[PDB]
Amino acid sequence: MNCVCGSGKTYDDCCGPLLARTRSAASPEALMRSRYAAYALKDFDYIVETTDPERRDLFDHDVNRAWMEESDFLELRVLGSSEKGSRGTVEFIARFRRGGGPEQSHHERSQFRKARGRWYFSEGEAVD
Ligand SMILES: [Zn+2]
């Protein structure tokens, strides 16, 4: 019994404290794979909350849903990650079934901003 996200953990022991909004991930990767689970659980509310203060204004309820509507999240596979005081960076691959049949994998590197000890998603794009 393992979590549906990059964590050798259960659902509760892993994503639970994050989705409960009770405990801070304290790590860029720890935040990322927990948010990934929220996408699969359509808890886009959690997503927005743990998004960068600047980027959070850019988010929308339906748009946040739009991704899961077309991309069925199968598995999350982290490649690398690093916390640097207040700046974080994580390279990953998100494997999802996009459409009726094809499994597509989104490989990119997301930067995270640390605010008040909590991690917030700043942005992510193709690995440079
Ligand atoms: Zn998890």
Side-chain angles (χ1 to χ4, degrees), residues 40-128:
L41 300 179
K42 60 266 173 174
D43 193 339
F44 50 84
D45 179 65
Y46 171 71
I47 304 306
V48 180
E49 298 177 285
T50 45
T51 304
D52 192 272
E54 300 178 70
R55 307 302 190 206
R56 183 164 59 238
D57 179 83
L58 307 176
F59 278 31
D60 176 88
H61 296 115
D62 295 280
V63 181
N64 291 328
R65 179 184 293 254
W67 290 300
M68 72 173 301
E69 301 288 275
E70 53 193 36
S71 307
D72 181 47
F73 301 100
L74 275 57
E75 182 178 272
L76 186 280
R77 177 177 180 186
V78 174
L79 305 185
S81 177
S82 301
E83 171 173 78
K84 298 298 298 176
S86 47
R87 178 57 56 125
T89 309
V90 54
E91 188 78 61
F92 64 89
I93 293 181
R95 181 184 182 127
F96 44 70
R97 180 179 46 136
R98 185 171 181 101
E103 295 167 72
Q104 181 180 148
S105 51
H106 195 154
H107 171 198
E108 63 174 20
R109 184 162 60 223
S110 298
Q111 299 70 86
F112 289 74
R113 169 175 289 143
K114 199 173 191 181
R116 299 300 77 228
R118 306 92 59 147
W119 280 98
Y120 298 86
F121 166 81
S122 302
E123 56 188 277
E125 61 184 282
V127 38
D128 67 277

Side-chain angles (χ1 to χ4, degrees), residues 2-16 18-19 30 33-38:
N2 187 34
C3 195
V4 301
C5 96
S7 306
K9 308 282 302 181
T10 64
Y11 168 69
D12 172 84
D13 286 282
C14 170
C15 284
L18 290 308
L19 277 169
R33 85 287 204 109
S34 299
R35 294 216 319 166
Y36 166 78

